[PDB]
Amino acid sequence: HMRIAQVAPLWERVPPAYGGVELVVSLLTEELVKRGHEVTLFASGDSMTQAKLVSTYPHAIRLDPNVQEYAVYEALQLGEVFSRANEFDVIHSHVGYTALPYTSLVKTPVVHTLHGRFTADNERIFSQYRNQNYVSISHSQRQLRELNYIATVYNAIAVETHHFYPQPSDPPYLAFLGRLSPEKGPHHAIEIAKRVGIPLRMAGKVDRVDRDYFKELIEPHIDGEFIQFIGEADHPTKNALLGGAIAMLFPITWQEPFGLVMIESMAAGTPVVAIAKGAAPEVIEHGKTGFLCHSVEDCVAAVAQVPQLDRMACRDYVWQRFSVERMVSEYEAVYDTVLANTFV
Amino acid sequence: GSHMRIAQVAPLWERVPPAYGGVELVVSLLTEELVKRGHEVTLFASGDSMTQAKLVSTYPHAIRLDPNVQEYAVYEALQLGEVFSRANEFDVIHSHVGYTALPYTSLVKTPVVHTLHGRFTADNERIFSQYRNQNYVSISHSQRQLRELNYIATVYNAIAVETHHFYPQPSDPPYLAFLGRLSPEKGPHHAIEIAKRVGIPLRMAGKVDRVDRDYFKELIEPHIDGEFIQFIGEADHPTKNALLGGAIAMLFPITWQEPFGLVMIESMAAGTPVVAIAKGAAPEVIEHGKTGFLCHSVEDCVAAVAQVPQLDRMACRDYVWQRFSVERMVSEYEAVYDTVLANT
Numbered sequence A: 001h002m003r004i005a006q007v008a009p010l011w012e013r014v015p016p017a018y019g020g021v022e023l024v025v026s027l028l029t030e031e032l033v034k035r036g037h038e039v040t041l042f043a044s045g046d047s048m049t050q051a052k053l054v055s056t057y058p059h060a061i062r063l064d065p066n067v068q069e070y071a072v073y074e075a076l077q078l079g080e081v082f083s084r085a086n087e088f089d090v091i092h093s094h095v096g097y098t099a100l101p102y103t104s105l106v107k108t109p110v111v112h113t114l115h116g117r118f119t120a121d122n123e124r125i126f127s128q129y130r131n132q133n134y135v136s137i138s139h140s141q142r143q144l145r146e147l148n149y150i151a152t153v154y155n156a157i158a159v160e161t162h163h164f165y166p167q168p169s170d171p172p173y174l175a176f177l178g179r180l181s182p183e184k185g186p187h188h189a190i191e192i193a194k195r196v197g198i199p200l201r202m203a204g205k206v207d208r209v210d211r212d213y214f215k216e217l218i219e220p221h222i223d224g225e226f227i228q229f230i231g232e233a234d235h236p237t238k239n240a241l242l243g244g245a246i247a248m249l250f251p252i253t254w255q256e257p258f259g260l261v262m263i264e265s266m267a268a269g270t271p272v273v274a275i276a277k278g279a280a281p282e283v284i285e286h287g288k289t290g291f292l293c294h295s296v297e298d299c300v301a302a303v304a305q306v307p308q309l310d311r312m313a314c315r316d317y318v319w320q321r322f323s324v325e326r327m328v329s330e331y332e333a334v335y336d337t338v339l340a341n342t343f344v
Numbered sequence B: 001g002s003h004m005r006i007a008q009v010a011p012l013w014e015r016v017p018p019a020y021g022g023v024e025l026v027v028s029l030l031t032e033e034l035v036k037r038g039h040e041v042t043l044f045a046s047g048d049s050m051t052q053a054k055l056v057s058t059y060p061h062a063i064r065l066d067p068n069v070q071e072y073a074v075y076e077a078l079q080l081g082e083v084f085s086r087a088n089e090f091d092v093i094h095s096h097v098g099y100t101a102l103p104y105t106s107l108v109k110t111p112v113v114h115t116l117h118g119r120f121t122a123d124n125e126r127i128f129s130q131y132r133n134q135n136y137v138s139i140s141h142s143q144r145q146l147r148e149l150n151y152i153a154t155v156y157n158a159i160a161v162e163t164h165h166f167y168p169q170p171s172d173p174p175y176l177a178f179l180g181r182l183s184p185e186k187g188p189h190h191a192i193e194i195a196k197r198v199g200i201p202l203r204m205a206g207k208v209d210r211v212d213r214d215y216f217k218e219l220i221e222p223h224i225d226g227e228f229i230q231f232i233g234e235a236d237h238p239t240k241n242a243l244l245g246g247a248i249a250m251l252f253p254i255t256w257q258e259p260f261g262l263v264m265i266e267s268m269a270a271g272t273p274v275v276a277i278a279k280g281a282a283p284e285v286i287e288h289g290k291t292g293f294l295c296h297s298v299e300d301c302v303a304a305v306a307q308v309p310q311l312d313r314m315a316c317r318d319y320v321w322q323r324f325s326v327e328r329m330v331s332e333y334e335a336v337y338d339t340v341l342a343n344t
């Protein structure tokens, strides 16, 4: 019953393959409008939404050879958001710190959902707008504390769209999903699959800056027989790619804000053996829906402890803490708190 | 009428500059002069910048040189956030950052004067036409490639000629010169081929950065390991002055729509003609047959070097004083402010 604006990034599509935030903004927007609200999506033009689409570019900036300066369309989008700031009751910004200086100029309250790691550089712009409205996707992400965190909403997925696999494929294999960046540590997943004797079926995208790390540590160890690649899969693939696997290796070497590939694996009914970094303990129920490992050798030992877990429970676990009914209804109270706590 | 509150917004890649510094040098002479005429200037640059106006530092070093910064876009939104939060304290804002400040102008009441320093790429042509009805000041006539914009004026950049020692006849062992970054846009590869057909050695001096590091190690690197081509890249003011002053003719072979190119008027300041390719804003600075030459190919330059000792080298210095003096530039910009302050 409010005028909401969801400012999504332009790198991807509301998303056929890669894209985490755009998937979260989708399940949020596609359900907010269903509850008699009034949302105006701010994303790309190829987006298939059920709200008033307002875009500055039709295609996605990532999969496009004709684009070169993304910061142009980054500033074009915000130029249309805060120009229409009088037509909105609350602005839900997902673009990150690029909207902080614009918030101190308009009148409409703006909420910022954090989606990345705080680095030694971006922590300065957050300290200059510490009292702004923030929303963390995990308690582990809340690292600055000095900011003004409104609440903590766990990212969710449409569980019914993920087909559930009870028993894995008869010839077992491991799994890896996500970008091939050092932030996800696929090189550990390569060794873990080889220290146990179970093949690995990887899947993800390789953008640049990852060109150096990929073809120096990941490409040398591809075979197609024991190590497959499948560069960037869609939804029906990762649905069955993780379903037929015994466990989704998630050996991160980076402060993971959340990790939607963990909750996606478990919907298909697959426990995630990940490193207890970032929001890994906040998602993985130890001994029930995965194993919170603390070393590379801990994952190898946990692999033998994977088949004894209940894969039918892993899906019912996502239906509890990681449901869209929990996430959207938890944002519906965040917007009211921001609107009720304004002037003093 | 002659007591304004100017707001100089400068880039952060280099300080207001030790060696390489294009836009940072123009802002320097413009700031130091306007303060010397009585205006209340407010500079938004780095921290080590040396000015007399009340500067507002957002990071105490040049980001290009400081390696601790991995995201330049962080301090971008910080500087622009501090400018337009104090816009009420200014009479007019002079932006030098580019398209990043266009959506900000459509949010306050202080008029902003945008001085363009870059080419209209296939991407920024979308944002510049969006904020078409604003206040733009070009730096050359050839730089105007949209035409349909709202150009307030065209103020050619200027340098302090008195700070450039005049070398009459150069060094008796003759050599050439190349100034500017070693980018395929400014064409450093063309300068060596002319140095072979003319047979005179070429002494270079520039800057190499990412995205172009592959080009440096490919085309330019296998030709400098010798006395014929002495590199010593990135020279400060007292070093690059003797380089151009001791050069019989500066090689400026460009293959890109140059908006201006301060390296040209710096060569002629110390008394040295420039042989540039007929492209961009080269005919607007170089006078054919008087203080240099304009060529349509590479062999046309080889025939031009044979007609350089006949060129007047003293008239090169007096030509910069004609239309590239700091007193002229600042007077034009000071006259631009009265145009913007009268339209409101």
Ligand SMILES: O=c1ccn([C@@H]2O[C@H](COP(=O)(O)OP(=O)(O)O)[C@@H](O)[C@H]2O)c(=O)[nH]1
Residues within 6 Å of the ligand: A016, A017, A018, A019, A020, A021, A023, A177, A178, A179, A203, A204, A205, A231, A232, A233, A234, A235, A238, A258, A259, A260, A261, A262, A264
């Ligand atoms: O082949 C792939 C690789 C990635 N993804 C999607 O990319 C998102 C990445 O999830 P996550 O948040 O955990 O990784 P990050 O955001 O750090 O890139 C997931 O939702 C996946 O659905 C996908 O669909 N197919």
Ligand SMILES: O=c1ccn([C@@H]2O[C@H](COP(=O)(O)OP(=O)(O)O)[C@@H](O)[C@H]2O)c(=O)[nH]1
Residues within 6 Å of the ligand: B018, B019, B020, B021, B022, B023, B025, B179, B180, B181, B205, B206, B207, B233, B234, B235, B236, B237, B240, B260, B261, B262, B263, B266
């Ligand atoms: O080794 C160098 C190379 C360049 N410059 C300075 O960088 C400026 C060149 O500006 P230009 O417009 O030609 O390059 P751009 O700004 O387009 O990058 C000149 O004033 C030079 O004084 C320098 O000092 N040393």
Ligand SMILES: OC[C@H]1O[C@](CO)(O[C@H]2O[C@H](CO)[C@@H](O)[C@H](O)[C@H]2O)[C@@H](O)[C@@H]1O
Residues within 6 Å of the ligand: A009, A011, A012, A018, A019, A020, A021, A022, A115, A179
């Ligand atoms: O760590 C940088 C990382 O962030 C980007 C965003 O451009 O990737 C994101 O892609 C989508 C949203 O664009 C989300 O899944 C999530 O925010 C990130 O994975 C990219 O620079 C880099 O891969």
Ligand SMILES: OC[C@H]1O[C@](CO)(O[C@H]2O[C@H](CO)[C@@H](O)[C@H](O)[C@H]2O)[C@@H](O)[C@@H]1O
Residues within 6 Å of the ligand: B011, B013, B021, B022, B023, B024, B097, B098, B181
């Ligand atoms: O505004 C960013 C601008 O800087 C880049 C960074 O890669 O490089 C330019 O930096 C100097 C700044 O003085 C420019 O004079 C010069 O054109 C570039 O080397 C450029 O791509 C970005 O557009």
